[PDB]
Amino acid sequence: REIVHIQAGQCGNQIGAKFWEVISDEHGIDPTGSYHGDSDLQLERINVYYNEAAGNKYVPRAILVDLEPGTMDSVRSGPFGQIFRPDNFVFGQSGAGNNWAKGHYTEGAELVDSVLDVVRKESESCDCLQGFQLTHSLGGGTGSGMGTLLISKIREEYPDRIMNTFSVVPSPKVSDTVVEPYNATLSVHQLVENTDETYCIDNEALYDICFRTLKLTTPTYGDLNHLVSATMSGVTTCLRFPGQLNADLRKLAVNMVPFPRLHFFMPGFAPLTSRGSQQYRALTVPELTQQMFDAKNMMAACDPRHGRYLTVAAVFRGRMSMKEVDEQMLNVQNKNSSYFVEWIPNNVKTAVCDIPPRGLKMSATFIGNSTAIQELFKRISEQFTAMFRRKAFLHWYTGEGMDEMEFTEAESNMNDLVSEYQQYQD
């Protein structure tokens, strides 16, 4: 087995709606309805994300944490919004100020206990717990601060179960906030030291990948979210399906993290073709690896081509030859020996489910642990200093009971984190 999703902040929340929008259909669960599942296999493993109460009501086992009512009151007042048991909504009608400090030390710190409470009600649900899924943005209060706390507590309560983190690291070109590097640097800090699998997505790496890899001209947020949620479904849920060679969070973790930092990955989906036309079906397989392993198509901002890889996990999910899979992976590992690090004879971790994404014939989620993501924490870390130096909007933090040594801490930490990652690029 199981897992318990966590919708920290608005973003992490907004996405919840999309991650569950999807996943459900990938499990035949209508709003409050039950399992309409076109098949019978989309049920033997659901437990991983739901709970048995009525007999038609398998309720998503996630948490909705946020200090801004309106948000959860938009997610709960729309489509699938009426499937979460109200108990799940851990709101904080307070002022959800955009301060990491306001949602981690002053405002969020209160709402925490009333959260952990539930995160335990859900964990002690039944069977055996695997880990928790965490969605949020490292550029706000309820996201980076309060969600980054939720984990620091989770990881003290079950240092056994895993912790995948889906972070929306502050996009480069244009940030959707001003203190961004403040709320960010501070949350990455907490991440590098609690969760043990992080999948960093960039609102603009998506646009690109969504406006040129999907001739999509008006990529609304819903979309971006939708694309992301597509990857997190391939990861988890997927592997909780049969397969010639299946893995599960741990395999993924125990094959992808060479060194305890926790390291962050960069997810990539397979068939990413525009609707009508493009429906080329060039998906024999070399076409999927063609996809997944290119620069563009990496939900991350940075480009792999800018730094070796430590590990890779092509989590495919659609009937294919353990030969044309196991094989391709190789040439790929040799055509690009340059960037793929050497002290790991077989960086790649081939994974293979069976049933594919409901309406598709063949897909393959990509979870890359490349050293390229160095060039992102750099970014973030830079923005900090350039503004920390002048203590820019620092009074909104300190004035909330913070420390001048707290910011120092994080930057350094996360800043060192950049350092290390280079220790392998070389």
């Binding site: 087995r1 125990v254 002290w343």
Partner: protein, 429 residues
């Protein structure tokens, strides 16, 4: 006699379902258990209508054993004999051997002690595992482990599917296979080996099909295996007991690993072509492109071969076809070995799946052997290991699972003397 069998790991279970299929198929026992001693060394005549299997199934994810209890054959085994640990598989030795795998073992054993009792003077347990897995490497490691002590007085022939030479799957594979070798080494009697990749070649080169589903490789081993137990434990003109093997097949205590090979692999659709001569199939056995193992006799001197024939075969035909071979020299046999050719003759010809892709001849040669060749295969698989260990790679995954720098480093040293062993017992006179 009989010979129980423990199919461990999803794979060992898929292959199991396969080898188990071929069985009834050539014994007239529909999936319903009913047919309308001889073969009692693999089937117990439970109740007064059926033939409950004579083995068990061990996987830590339900998925794979589940599928068995869906598809006809569902009726074949006892609801009991298919062990599962709803928990987690984990493609890591440690967890499967120590931590998790432990919890189940007792229960597992219980069956191989409950199924081992019910019989009449047995001979051993044909174990089916997939070297580089979690439930397959680890678990068994201690299963065979707990057997060598509870029945040291029997045969422990483990039929493995060791790591594809270049087409491996798991990222860690070697960690899991250098560990299943060292822990099982001091416990097995004879370990048969069938290379997953080197079998594909056979499907490409000797049958033609770029569409080989796992379900095929399984039909194949599912064949070579049928030649081992099934038919052999079955009357014939030159019977060969299980003990026979290990005796005529292992020169030294290391649970020595021979290689499985089959002769007639030809695709249906070829099915009509004039059949092959006793001489041709015999000769096909000395071709490094037909041996279910990427251990091409690159130098490895054979040191003992057990030519199991089945079907219409005249002992002179053999005691001649083999003579011709003994004098080909380019087939160089070890020094300290005058004659190393155990001729096993059975009656009943092979039995091909009704409509898979196997030719269906009236005679075959499932020759297995110990070849100084694996000096390679082990080498190439050991080296792998180091590279990663050299950086600890996925080490934290085992340590955190009740293992230590010991078990790795000390299981590496282990195989080291397996690279020297397979070197000394040959290459020298």
């Amino acid at each position: 006699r009989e010979c129980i069998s423990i199919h461990v790991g999803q794979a060992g279970v898929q292959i199991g379902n396969a080898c188990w299929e071929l069985y009834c198929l050539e014994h007239g026992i529909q999936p319903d258990g009913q047919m309308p001693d001889s073969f009692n060394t693999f089937f117990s005549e439970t109740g007064a209508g059926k033939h409950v299997p004579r083995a068990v199934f061990v996987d830590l994810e339900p998925t794979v054993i589940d599928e068995v209890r869906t598809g006809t054959y569902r009726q074949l085994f006892h609801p009991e004999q298919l062990i599962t640990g709803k928990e987690d598989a984990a493609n890591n030795y440690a967890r499967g051997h120590y931590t998790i795998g432990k919890e189940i073992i007792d229960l597992v054993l219980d069956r191989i002690r409950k199924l081992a009792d019910q019989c009449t003077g047995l001979q051993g347990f044909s174990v089916f595992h997939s070297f580089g897995g979690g439930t397959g490497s680890g678990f068994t490691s201690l299963l065979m482990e707990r057997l060598s002590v509870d029945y040291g007085k029997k045969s422990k022939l483990e039929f493995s599917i060791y790591p594809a030479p270049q087409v491996s799957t798991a990222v860690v594979e070697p960690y899991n296979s250098i560990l299943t070798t060292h822990t099982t080494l001091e416990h097995s009697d004879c370990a048969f080996m069938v290379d997953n990749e080197a079998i594909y070649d056979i499907c490409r080169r000797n049958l033609d099909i770029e569409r080989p589903t796992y379900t095929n490789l399984n039909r194949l081993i599912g064949q070579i295996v049928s030649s081992i137990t099934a038919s052999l434990r079955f009357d014939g003109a030159l019977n060969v007991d299980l003990t026979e093997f290990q005796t005529n097949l292992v020169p030294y205590p290391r649970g020595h690993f021979p290689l499985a090979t089959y002769a007639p692999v030809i695709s249906a659709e070829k099915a009509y072509h004039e059949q092959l001569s006793v001489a041709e199939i015999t000769n096909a056995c000395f071709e490094p492109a037909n041996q279910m193992v990427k251990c091409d006799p690159r130098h490895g001197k054979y040191m003992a071969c057990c030519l199991l024939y089945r079907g219409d075969v005249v002992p002179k035909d053999v005691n001649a076809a083999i003579a011709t071979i003994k004098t080909k020299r380019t087939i160089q046999f070890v020094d300290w070995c005058p004659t190393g050719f155990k001729v096993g003759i059975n009656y009943e010809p092979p039995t091909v799946v009704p409509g898979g892709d196997l030719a269906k001849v009236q005679r075959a040669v499932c020759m297995l052997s110990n070849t100084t060749a694996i000096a390679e295969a082990w080498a190439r698989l050991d080296h792998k290991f180091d590279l990663m260990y050299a950086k600890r790679a996925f080490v934290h995954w085992y340590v955190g699972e009740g293992m230590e720098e010991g078990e790795f480093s000390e299981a590496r040293e282990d195989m080291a003397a397996l690279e020297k062993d397979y070197e000394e017992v040959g290459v020298d006179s």
